[PDB]
Design a protein around this nucleic acid. Structure first.
Ligand SMILES: [Mg+2]
Ligand SMILES: [Mg+2]
Ligand SMILES: [Mg+2]
Ligand SMILES: [Mg+2]
Ligand SMILES: [Mg+2]
Ligand SMILES: [Mg+2]
Ligand SMILES: [Mg+2]
Ligand SMILES: [Mg+2]
Ligand SMILES: [Mg+2]
Ligand SMILES: [Mg+2]
Ligand SMILES: [Mg+2]
Ligand SMILES: [Mg+2]
Ligand SMILES: [Mg+2]
Ligand SMILES: [Mg+2]
Ligand SMILES: [Mg+2]
Ligand SMILES: [Mg+2]
Ligand SMILES: [Mg+2]
Ligand SMILES: [Mg+2]
Ligand SMILES: [Mg+2]
Ligand SMILES: [Mg+2]
Ligand SMILES: [Mg+2]
Ligand SMILES: [Mg+2]
Ligand SMILES: [Mg+2]
Ligand SMILES: [Mg+2]
Ligand SMILES: [Mg+2]
Ligand SMILES: [Zn+2]
Lengths: 97, 98, 51, 165, 73
RNA sequence: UUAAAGGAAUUGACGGAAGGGCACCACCAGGAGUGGAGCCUGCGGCUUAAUUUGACUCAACACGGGAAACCUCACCCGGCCCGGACACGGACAGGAUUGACAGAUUGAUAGCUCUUUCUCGAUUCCGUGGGUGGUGGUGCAUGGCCGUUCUUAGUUGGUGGAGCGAUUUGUCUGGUUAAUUCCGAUAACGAACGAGACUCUGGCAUGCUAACUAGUUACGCGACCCCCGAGCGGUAACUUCUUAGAGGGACAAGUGGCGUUCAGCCACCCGAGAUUGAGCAAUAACAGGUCUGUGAUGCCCUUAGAUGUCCGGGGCUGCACGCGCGCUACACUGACUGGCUCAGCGUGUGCCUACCCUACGCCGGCAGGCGCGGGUAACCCGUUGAACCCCAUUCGUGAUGGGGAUCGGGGAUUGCAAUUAUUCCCCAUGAACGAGGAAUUCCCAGUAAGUGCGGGUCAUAAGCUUGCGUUGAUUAAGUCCCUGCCCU
């Protein structure tokens, strides 16, 4: 049983990670670590201009997709109990049993 | 050129049921995607809603491809002539509230 | 009535943009449909920054 | 039964945010529109519109916010009342430059000439706790040529990373 | 530029279709003051010939709603 | 005959005027080249019914991410549709308002028209006004955006001095720096934008935080060899190797010297580094480009046989020519054949509306086809067994086996359709080219260059462009001589 926390930005990622570990320390569960994933980046290059005047001046737009995975062996009632989290809206939660 | 009577009552019946209509710009030339609510894709919908947006009955909005149709209290006051055909029922926008 | 011939299932005409149905300029395949002009103004709204 | 990848669902959500925010600043130009904060919840898709004049958002008898809910739900595919809208009041009117330009548009339409309108909005922004402001008006301004009229007061940073926030 | 698309009309100054008929169209025949004799051949049972009749041709036939083709020597 | 000619004085600009500094879009010592040949891709000019158009020194010319069979298409030829909203009003068909079977013509089974006559039916058709559409003109009306002045460090108000005044002082004699960066003096004071400061990447490290969607140490299952406890590979602990979360680490700090008390400069060491590369980037302008990105827009033009929109062909690919960016060669440091061995960005499916990444096995020599499986992704492609490079054979200075342009026949793949363009593969044909004149472009350390890969258009589709990797130079680290810039 695994839980994936995929965040938009690093600050909300670390806040929801600290909150989830703080909520998982007190229970009698062998909590695995917040396994760091490689950061994904969608690089987009743009001409910057509708008509071709001047030098070849190009944009560089990026994102920073951040992802964490944990493993929590638990019954489904305890998983649904842990599932209720006051969370930042920039964090997506996925579960897998 | 005559629209079917089932369509001519059904698009206004859907407008009576909701009050919010949605279509897009794609009039039939690359592809024929039928409407997610009704049968005719875009052309009969535009021909039905142009008579409402022409006389100031239902307002028009645009979101990058999509024509949204906006309902007014004065719009309902002018659609009272269509409301003669059913019994007097305010649609699910104005009467009740939760 | 022969209204819809030349079915346009490929190529340039099949790419219709979400912004203004632009078809002379290209449309990128990134899970995205922009016009490369308005993408500059709208990248900060859809989540892209310059860095 | 369908799914899309993490590399595309985020840009689809970003295009959704841009679509919703820019269409609401298209059609809600009357009141004071600041922005939206859409929250992710697998039971109720919450859309929080932060506005200055919340009267046009709330409507007369609770009508226009439910009409916007219908506008969202009858295209974006959320049946059974999944999308829920909440309006928030912004007590600081002079804080949002989007709202200030939104008011300046309708003030410059019906009379209220450019000089006195710029002095009025600079007085309002200087009263509303702001450290610095700049209003640039370009176009045919009392002549056939385009004369850029600039009105700047206070403390304004133009270069660097923290310009955006 | 300074291009121009004007009227030359090499072939014909053609026009479109306008349906012209008689004043009224009678399909029946009065016999014995109450019996109607049928003049035109009906259409077979394919949800067409309930009220749709065939057009007179030398060897062909026509459904108005369904465009059925039938031929006999 | 003329409405100015004049005088000092203020601010720009200019000087083949002086002083002080900067820059490889400048030079020196150099490196790689272009311009010479072939080809690709754009421009001008020709030709045609059309060969659609904008852009013309940096600041256009593989730019419109402009790689077109129709698609894109805005250009020529032919043919349909009105999506002609809506107010009045003409016939109102005693209800026949627009879709059509068969034959002639037209690519068409376009009811385009004609012969013929059935049909959903108060939506019609037409006129009078208005409205809509236009990749039509106008960027010399404009908004927004971009480029350039300008990648140099410059710019401005408040109060107070000088002058009637435009203006000036603040914004500087001098020293220093990449900088109007600072110290200092000072009729100026307190200030502001900008530069720095900011964000990311690269460099070092924690036995802090951790990992079965990433590995190690021993251990067993377990194949081979000596058989002498050894050696290569397949299938209980902690992050050293792949990832990032916080924090640290570098600030000209310590020493010697030069500098004015200063501001600062040069060499050492500890260090991974004595500072890398980008982004953002001021006041004010160009009468720079874009109306052909937008239902962003003012005026004019067309609105029924349409400058609106569909369908079928051609075209932008058309060549007596010149020019620009690029690819390949002109061989022996090499070409061919065989063996060996290494990666990093980044991409991939049933999409807000039609689509891939391919692993394994079989068949075919080849491009390819078939059966099946995995991957909505650190899971599978994939430990991207990449090219140059590392060894062995052949070639032998010959326009040669370097060069593969041109041309003929055939075989597979995407697409409905490739012939006046796909693309790839097999054979064959084997030109010019002997290191390029006048002139000219870029560059100082993981740098130029050699070489390959990923993304953009993509369906087939890179010689373009953006990024990533492998090998990796010579020589300056100075100057204002050519060009240009900053301040007196
Ligand atoms: Mg301007
Ligand atoms: Mg004088
Ligand atoms: Mg030189
Ligand atoms: Mg060369
Ligand atoms: Mg040449
Ligand atoms: Mg040449
Ligand atoms: Mg021109
Ligand atoms: Mg247009
Ligand atoms: Mg201009
Ligand atoms: Mg302009
Ligand atoms: Mg001009
Ligand atoms: Mg500047
Ligand atoms: Mg004075
Ligand atoms: Mg001054
Ligand atoms: Mg480590
Ligand atoms: Mg309009
Ligand atoms: Mg062309
Ligand atoms: Mg040409
Ligand atoms: Mg070029
Ligand atoms: Mg050869
Ligand atoms: Mg030869
Ligand atoms: Mg080479
Ligand atoms: Mg592809
Ligand atoms: Mg490609
Ligand atoms: Mg190109
Ligand atoms: Zn568009």
């Amino acid at each position: 049983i695994r839980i994936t926390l995929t965040s938009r930005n690093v600050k909300s990622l670390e806040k929801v990670c600290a909150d989830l570990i703080r909520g998982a320390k007190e229970k009698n569960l062998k909590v695995k670590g917040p396994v760091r994933m490689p950061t994904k980046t969608l690089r987009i290059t743009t001409r910057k201009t509708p008509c071709g005047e001047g030098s070849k001046t190009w944009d560089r737009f990026q994102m920073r997709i951040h992802k964490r995975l944990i493993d929590l062996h638990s019954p489904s009632e305890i998983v649904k109990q842990i599932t209720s989290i006051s969370i930042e809206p920039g964090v997506e939660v996925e579960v897998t049993i | 050129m005559l629209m079917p009577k089932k369509n001519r009552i059904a698009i206004y019946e859907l407008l009576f049921k909701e009050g919010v209509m949605v279509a897009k710009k794609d009039v039939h030339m690359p592809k024929h995607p039928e409407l997610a609510d009704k049968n005719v894709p875009n052309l009969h919908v535009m021909k039905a809603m142009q008579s409402l947006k022409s006389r100031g009955y239902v307002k028009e909005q645009f979101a990058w491809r999509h024509f949204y149709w906006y309902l007014t209290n004065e719009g309902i006051q002018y659609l009272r002539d269509y409301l003669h055909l059913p019994p007097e029922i305010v649609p699910a926008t104005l009467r009740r509230s939760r | 009535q022969l209204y819809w011939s030349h079915p346009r299932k490929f190529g340039q005409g099949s790419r219709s943009c979400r912004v203004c149905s632009n078809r002379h300029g290209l449309i990128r395949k990134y899970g995205l449909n922009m016009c490369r002009q308005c993408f500059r103004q709208y990248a900060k709204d859809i989540g892209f920054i310059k860095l | 039964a369908v799914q899309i990848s993490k590399k595309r669902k985020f840009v689809a959500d970003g295009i959704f945010k841009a679509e919703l925010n820019e269409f609401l600043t298209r059609e809600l130009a009357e009141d004071g529109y600041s922005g939206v904060e859409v929250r992710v919840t697998p039971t109720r898709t919450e859309i929080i519109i932060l506005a200055t004049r919340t009267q046009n958002v709330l409507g007369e008898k609770g009508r226009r916010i439910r009409e916007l809910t219908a506008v969202v739900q009858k295209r974006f595919g959320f049946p059974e009342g999944s999308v829920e809208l909440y309006a928030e009041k912004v007590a600081t009117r002079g804080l949002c430059a989007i709202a200030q330009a939104e008011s300046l548009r309708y003030k410059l339409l019906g009379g209220l000439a450019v000089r006195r309108a710029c002095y009025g909005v600079l007085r309002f922004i200087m009263e509303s706790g702001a450290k610095g402001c700049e209003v640039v008006v370009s176009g045919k301004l009392r002549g056939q040529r385009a004369k850029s009229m600039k009105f700047v007061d206070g403390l304004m940073i133009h270069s660097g990373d923290p310009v955006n926030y | 530029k300074r291009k121009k698309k004007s009227y030359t009309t090499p072939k014909k100054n053609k026009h479109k279709r306008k349906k012209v008929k008689l004043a009224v169209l009678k399909y029946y025949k009065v016999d014995e003051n109450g019996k109607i004799s049928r003049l035109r051949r009906e259409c077979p049972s394919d949800e067409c010939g309930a009220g749709v009749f065939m057009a007179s041709h030398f060897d062909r036939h026509y459904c108005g709603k369904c465009c059925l083709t039938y031929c006999f020597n």
